[PDB]
Write an enzyme that holds these catalytic residues in place. Structure first.
Site, PDB file in Angstrom:
ATOM      1  N   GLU B 357       0.820  -1.207   0.000  1.00 58.98           N
ATOM      2  CA  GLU B 357       0.000   0.000   0.000  1.00 58.98           C
ATOM      3  C   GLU B 357       0.857   1.261   0.000  1.00 58.98           C
ATOM      4  O   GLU B 357       0.440   2.288  -0.546  1.00 58.98           O
ATOM      5  CB  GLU B 357      -0.960   0.004   1.194  1.00 58.98           C
ATOM      6  CG  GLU B 357      -1.932  -1.179   1.257  1.00 58.98           C
ATOM      7  CD  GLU B 357      -3.049  -1.126   0.225  1.00 58.98           C
ATOM      8  OE1 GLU B 357      -3.262  -0.066  -0.397  1.00 58.98           O
ATOM      9  OE2 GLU B 357      -3.720  -2.162   0.035  1.00 58.98           O
ATOM     10  N   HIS B 487     -15.766  -9.667  -7.812  1.00 60.56           N
ATOM     11  CA  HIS B 487     -15.482  -8.764  -8.928  1.00 60.56           C
ATOM     12  C   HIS B 487     -16.499  -8.899 -10.056  1.00 60.56           C
ATOM     13  O   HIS B 487     -16.897  -7.898 -10.662  1.00 60.56           O
ATOM     14  CB  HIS B 487     -14.068  -9.013  -9.452  1.00 60.56           C
ATOM     15  CG  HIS B 487     -13.004  -8.830  -8.418  1.00 60.56           C
ATOM     16  ND1 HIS B 487     -12.609  -9.841  -7.567  1.00 60.56           N
ATOM     17  CD2 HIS B 487     -12.259  -7.749  -8.086  1.00 60.56           C
ATOM     18  CE1 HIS B 487     -11.662  -9.392  -6.763  1.00 60.56           C
ATOM     19  NE2 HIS B 487     -11.431  -8.126  -7.057  1.00 60.56           N
TER      20      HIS B 487
END
Ligand code: NAG
Ligand code: NAG
Ligand code: NAG
Ligand code: NAG
Ligand code: NAG
Ligand code: NAG
Lengths: 99, 596
Positions: B357, B487
């Site tokens: 991240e 998804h």
């Protein structure tokens, strides 16, 4: 969000040095006349900077004071302060009193 | 005066007001995510409606500037991005129906609760109730029960919804001058107008097949080894000649194989590289984890984190009283505001996630000089790939020894590298045929190659052909087995993981060649190398201003996605799997030999 600070985003020509533009006339980017309404191709010159505390250092508000010093043919009267060496008496010293 | 200058001023005003509105919307989303309260939900919804209405008005106003009178490539790229209709080209009734269908699929997936018949007094949700069962159980019929019951409930709810969804999305895509919705998704990689570096929507499927044909032997050997180990774990269910049973892959759908590392370990007697106990002994806080990550990113030459990052990020779980989303997410809120929302524990996984991240944050910081509508990755693969390369580099034993987390007398022999590479293959290589099969099936559904009455007969045929996974019992057309995944049920592209996986090892080879590493590729660490960081930052600073082919030329020196770095990364493991598969049979049979 603090929307009290604005900036002129457009104008037909660049500013001259030490010029102030406070006009609020609608910028004409196109051939069509704006006629005072912010329609197609016609935008408002002054845009706010939505200053929020959580901003980056490149987006945080900075107060700028620019001091301009000029010399004109009139006698210069805004002089920086001079100091005063402790007066010594009864000795052969080099004195400088008011020039 | 001219059309191009008019478009440039319109883009400037657009940019300026967009950055502020995106900031307000992103800050509302942040305040919802760190503080789940109903007024924050209302503020998020108001900001999102304002953002969507502003995008609608600028899309309505951008189309009045014709494209062919603009010669500057960046201005034409921003105008092309803005002039997309989206759902606005569709009728208001069908747009409302599509939005309602998407929202109700989101509610069905999020609030889907399934438990055993005749014991209905309490039930378990998917996360974390079913995830832990799928990842840790060793019982055949319990996993079969959970798998079949969750695909029964979710598929029988979602099948008419998905049948409406495909028709509405195809109508929207053909209203936007695309062949299908698959062509709309493939248009993200479309490069037009650049001499030599042009990329077509039809070239993407050919490149994916060309790379997967070289993927296929390594995946066949890995599938044979996992089949033999699951035959050892489950004696009678798995056939020597057939495919793997679907509910035994360690996850709910087969997305990752990383939960089979305990069952399929080569050398259990040898130790692991777990550094969790060392941080517990040295009392490493999550702040120390992020400071070590920042030390890693300043060692390669990238900029360090801002003061606003340390002030405004939530790097620790707040407590019982305040609720927050536990999923780690990097937020580029706009106006130089970069934050990480992660409930960081003292584990290796959270440390690698912190590196991943913060790689996302570095990528977001690099294109801050770009205009607002160009502040993205060059494609959807690069943005995840630049985090995955940090996850690769931080996981190395050299990095752990360098930062003091591993003992200096730890013996790095070939067996630990083999089992580490097998774990990385179960995480990374195993998702590739599932991703390719899912995207090819969705492309054939949108293209109309597969009729609605033949969706599942083809699909399992694809899964046997590509993934090498057999259904436990046959499913009819009342099931909707793909849409149980996050998804596909929530209208997300899935080829980003395939492109991310290949770009990951391409970037890894490029930076390790830049860093002059002289050993194996998986032994390579990109710390202390200024030139590798400079080669990275040259692509990182571009953002979406340049084509992804030109960016890939800037990094690896190639004009196309390549499969050879992945095969070079797993080459010791490939030789080891070829040695271990001498007696066994590589490849599978599409027949019903294990179970049907
Ligand atoms: C989260 O919301 C609650 C609800 O009002 C509030 O009391 C609390 O101060 C908020 N948390 C923070 C960190 O502001
Ligand atoms: C395109 O426009 C940008 C500003 O939006 C400018 O910096 C760049 O030089 C222009 N490129 C060409 C080739 O005119
Ligand atoms: C968007 O839709 C309008 C009609 O609703 C159409 O005139 C326009 O060409 C479309 N935009 C593009 C880029 O095709
Ligand atoms: C980032 O590095 C600069 C220069 O080394 C330093 O002045 C600054 O304090 C650093 N930022 C933080 C948050 O420590
Ligand atoms: C590791 O190396 C030793 C000696 O070179 C060899 O005997 C052994 O088989 C190797 N193990 C693997 C898994 O390659
Ligand atoms: C990389 O740089 C850091 C900071 O100077 C240092 O602590 C570390 O040991 C270096 N790495 C290697 C392998 O020398």
């Amino acid at each position: 969000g603090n929307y009290n600070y604005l900036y002129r985003l457009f104008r037909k020509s660049n500013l001259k040095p030490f010029e102030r533009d406070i006009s609020t006339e609608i910028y004409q980017a196109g051939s069509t006349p704006c006629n005072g309404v912010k329609g197609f191709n016609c935008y408002f010159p002054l845009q706010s900077y939505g200053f929020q505390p959580t901003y980056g250092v490149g987006y945080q508000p900075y107060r700028v004071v620019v001091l301009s010093f000029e010399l004109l043919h009139a006698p210069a009267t805004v002089c920086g302060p001079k100091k005063s060496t402790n007066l010594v008496k009864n000795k052969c010293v080099n004195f400088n009193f008011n020039g | 005066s001219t059309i191009e200058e008019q478009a440039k001023t319109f883009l400037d005003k657009f940019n300026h007001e967009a950055e502020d509105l995106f900031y307000q919307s992103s800050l509302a989303s942040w305040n919802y995510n760190t503080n789940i309260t109903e007024e924050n939900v209302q503020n998020m919804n108001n900001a999102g409606d304002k953002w969507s209405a502003f995008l609608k008005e600028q899309s309505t106003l951008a189309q009045m500037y014709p494209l062919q009178e603009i010669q500057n490539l960046t201005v034409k790229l921003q105008l092309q991005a803005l002039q997309q209709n989206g759902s606005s080209v569709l009728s208001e009734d069908k747009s409302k129906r599509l939005n309602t269908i998407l929202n109700t699929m989101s509610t069905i997936y999020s609030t889907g609760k399934v438990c055993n018949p005749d014991n209905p007094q309490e039930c378990l949700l998917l996360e974390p109730g079913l995830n832990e069962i799928m990842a840790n159980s060793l019982d055949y019929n319990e996993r079969l029960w959970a798998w079949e019951s969750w695909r029964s409930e979710v598929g029988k709810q979602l099948r008419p919804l998905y049948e409406e969804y495909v028709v509405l999305k195809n109508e929207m895509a053909r209203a936007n001058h695309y062949e299908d919705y698959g062509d709309y998704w493939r248009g993200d990689y479309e490069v037009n107008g650049v001499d030599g570096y042009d990329y077509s929507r039809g070239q993407l499927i050919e490149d994916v097949e060309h790379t997967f044909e070289e993927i296929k032997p390594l995946y066949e050997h890995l599938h044979a080894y996992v089949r033999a180990k699951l035959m050892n774990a489950y004696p009678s269910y798995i056939s020597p000649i057939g495919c793997l049973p679907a509910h035994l892959l360690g996850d709910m759908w087969g997305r990752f194989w990383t939960n089979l590392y305990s069952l399929t370990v080569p050398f259990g007697q040898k130790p692991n590289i777990d550094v969790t106990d060392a941080m517990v002994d040295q009392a490493w806080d999550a702040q120390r984890i992020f400071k070590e990550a920042e030390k890693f990113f300043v060692s390669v030459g990238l900029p360090n984190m801002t003061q606003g990052f340390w002030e405004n990020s939530m790097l620790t779980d707040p407590g019982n009283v305040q609720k927050a989303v536990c999923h780690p997410t990097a937020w580029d809120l706009g106006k130089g505001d970069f934050r990480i929302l992660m409930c960081t524990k003292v584990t290796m996984d959270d440390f690698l996630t912190a590196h991943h991240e913060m790689g996302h944050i570095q990528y977001d910081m690099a294109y801050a000089a770009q205009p607002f509508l160009l502040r993205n990755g060059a494609n959807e693969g690069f943005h995840e790939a630049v985090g995955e390369i940090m996850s690769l580099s931080a996981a190395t034993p050299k990095h752990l020894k360098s930062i003091g987390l591993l003992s200096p007398d730890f013996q790095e022999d070939n067996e630990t590298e083999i089992n580490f590479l097998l774990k990385q293959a179960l995480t990374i290589v195993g998702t590739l045929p599932f991703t390719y099969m899912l995207e090819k099936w969705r492309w054939m559904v949108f293209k109309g190659e597969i009729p609605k009455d033949q969706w599942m007969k083809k699909w399992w045929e694809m899964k046997r052909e590509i993934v090498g996974v057999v259904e436990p019992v046959p499913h009819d057309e009342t099931y909707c087995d793909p849409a149980s995944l996050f998804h596909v049920s929530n209208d997300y592209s899935f080829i980003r993981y395939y492109t991310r996986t290949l770009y990951q090892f391409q970037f890894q080879e490029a930076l390790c060649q830049a860093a002059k590493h002289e050993g194996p590729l998986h032994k390579c660490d990109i710390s202390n190398s200024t030139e590798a960081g400079q080669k990275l930052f040259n692509m990182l600073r571009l953002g979406k201003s340049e084509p992804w082919t030109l960016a890939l030329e800037n990094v690896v020196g190639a004009k196309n996605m390549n499969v050879r770095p992945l095969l070079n990364y797993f080459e010791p493991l490939f030789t080891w799997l070829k040695d271990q598969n001498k007696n066994s049979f590589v490849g599978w049979s599409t027949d019903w030999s294990p179970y049907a």
